[PDB]
Paper text:
The Mononegavirales order groups five families of monopartite, negative-strand RNA viruses many of which are highly pathogenic and/or contagious; the Filoviridae (of which Ebola virus is a representative), the Bornaviridae (Borna disease virus), the Nyamiviridae (midway virus), the Rhabdoviridae (rabies, vesicular stomatitis virus (VSV)) and the Paramyxoviridae (measles virus, human metapneumovirus (hMPV)). These viruses encode a large RNA polymerase (L) (usually >2,000 amino acids) that is crucial to viral replication. As a part of this study, we expressed CR-VI+, a 406-residue fragment comprising CR-VI and the adjoining ‘+ domain’, the variable region carrying the K-K-G-motif, investigated its MTase activity and solved its crystal structure. Besides sequentially methylating the 2′O and N7 atoms of small capped RNAs, CR-VI+ also 2′O methylates uncapped substrates and displays nucleotide triphosphatase (NTPase) activity. Both the CR-VI domain, which assumes a fairly standard MTase fold, and the K-K-G motif of the (mainly helical) +domain are required for the MTase reactions.
Most notably, hMPV and flaviviruses share an unusually long (∼10 residues), flexible β2λ (that is, the loop immediately following the β2-strand), which forms the SAM-binding pocket (SAMP) along with loops β1λ and β4λ, shielding it from the solvent. In CR-VI+, β2λ similarly assumes alternate conformations. Loops β1λ and β4λ also show a degree of flexibility. β1λ residue E1697, conserved in paramyxo- and filoviruses, forms a hydrogen bond with the NH2 group of SAM and is essential for both MTase activities. However, in the absence of SAM, its side chain either moves into the sub-pocket that normally accommodates the NH2 group, or, more markedly, turns towards the solvent in the direction of β2λ, which in this case assumes the ‘open’ position. β4λ forms a side wall of SAMP, and together with αD and β5 also defines a deep, hydrophobic cavity not present in other MTases, termed NSP (or nucleoside-binding pocket).
Numbering used by the authors: 1617 to 1636, 1642 to 1919, 1939 to 2005
Write the structure that this text describes.
């Protein structure tokens, strides 16, 4: 059942800034190296965007008002955001698109493991070329209605654009489509595009007839970043959110709010992330379990293994704290040779380490 499965997803905290004087800067230098935003994502293996952003939480009223039958997703991932959306709205259907590559993801692996069946996905994107899956290409939009004949009411883009102009290329193409499309023009100018954007400069105008409604700053976003989500529509264009706006809102959420843990614990997922971090790791991860992984080793792979145990060992010895960057900074600055950890382990393994670290801290006391 979709609604029962929603309990494995964590509560989202965000800041909404409607686009419709001197506001001093909020600053706090957190001495953190690890990606602590994955601390409440222990229940998800491949993708985990559903823990970062949600439609019922952010655009809940817009979902109720527009009441779409089909939701369009252009996110280059395993479909965890789409998986959460299926749990929130169990009668909604989906059109899925992701850039076709062997390097990255181009199939809903996470949606399939969360929901079970792909029956609700009416357009998996199968049989499409590399450019017909690329949001920055015309032919991608020309083939979006190949199955779904419903208007693009709410289009959701989680694409991570290499170039900042590539975001614009995608936006201009969305505008061109909604103002041309026989289906979409019948629905009117009350069409939306909710997309991930990296705020870098100030007073940067959006393309012609593209108006920003609100800007959402997520707790789940990388602290050191400037990633936000912007709701866009047809109307007299305004400027994109500036780098300053985001940092202050981002800081408040980091300084004040705590990371909410998931109501339920998917043991299958936790077992999977544990074996993916260190093959042989079993739950619960106690002192006896960690001493077993040490004796098993008695080489680069054996050096990488020891680094992992030593960190998980530090978590066991560390007291239970509130899930906030102040406590994560403490955890980091109390563990000696933190630089050895960052040097030995790659970006994916370091994300896997924090998912398991999070499981531990939640399982404490
Ligand atoms: Zn259309």
């Amino acid at each position: 059942d979709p609604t029962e499965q929603l309990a494995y997803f964590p509560k989202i905290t965000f800041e909404r800034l409607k686009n419709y004087y001197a506001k001093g800067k909020l600053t706090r230098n957190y001495m953190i190296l690890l990606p602590w935003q994955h601390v409440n994502r222990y229940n998800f293996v491949f993708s985990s965007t559903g823990c970062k952003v949600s439609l019922k939480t952010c655009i809940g009223k817009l979902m109720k008002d527009l009441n779409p039958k089909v939701l369009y997703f252009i996110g280059e991932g395993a479909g965890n955001w789409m998986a959460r959306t299926a749990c929130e709205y169990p009668d909604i259907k989906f059109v899925y698109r992701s850039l076709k590559d062997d390097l990255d993801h181009h199939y809903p692996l996470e949606y399939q493991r969360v929901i079970g069946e792909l029956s609700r996905i009416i357009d998996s994107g199968e049989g499409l070329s590399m450019e017909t899956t690329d949001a920055t290409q015309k032919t991608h939009w020309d083939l979006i209605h190949r199955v779904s004949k419903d208007a693009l009411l709410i289009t959701l883009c989680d694409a991570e654009f290499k170039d900042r102009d590539d975001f614009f290329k995608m936006v201009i193409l969305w505008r061109k489509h909604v103002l041309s499309c026989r289906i979409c023009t019948t629905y009117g100018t009350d069409l939306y595009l909710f997309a991930k954007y990296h705020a870098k400069d100030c007073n940067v105008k959006l393309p012609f007839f593209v108006r920003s409604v609100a800007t959402f700053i997520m707790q789940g976003s990388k602290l050191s970043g400037s990633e936000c989500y912007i709701l866009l529509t047809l109307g007299h264009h305004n400027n994109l959110p500036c780098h300053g706006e985001i940092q202050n809102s981002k800081m408040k959420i980091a300084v004040c709010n705590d990371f909410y843990a998931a109501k339920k614990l998917d043991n299958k997922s936790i077992e999977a992330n544990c074996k993916s971090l260190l093959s042989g790791l079993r739950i619960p991860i106690n002192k006896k379990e960690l001493n077993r992984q040490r004796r098993l080793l008695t080489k680069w792979l054996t050096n990488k293994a020891n680094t992992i145990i030593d960190w998980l060992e530090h978590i066991l010895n560390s007291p239970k704290g509130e899930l906030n960057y102040d406590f994560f900074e403490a955890l980091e600055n109390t563990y000696p040779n933190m630089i050895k950890l960052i040097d030995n382990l790659g970006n994916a393994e370091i994300k896997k380490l924090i998912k398991v670290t999070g499981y531990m801290l939640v399982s404490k006391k």
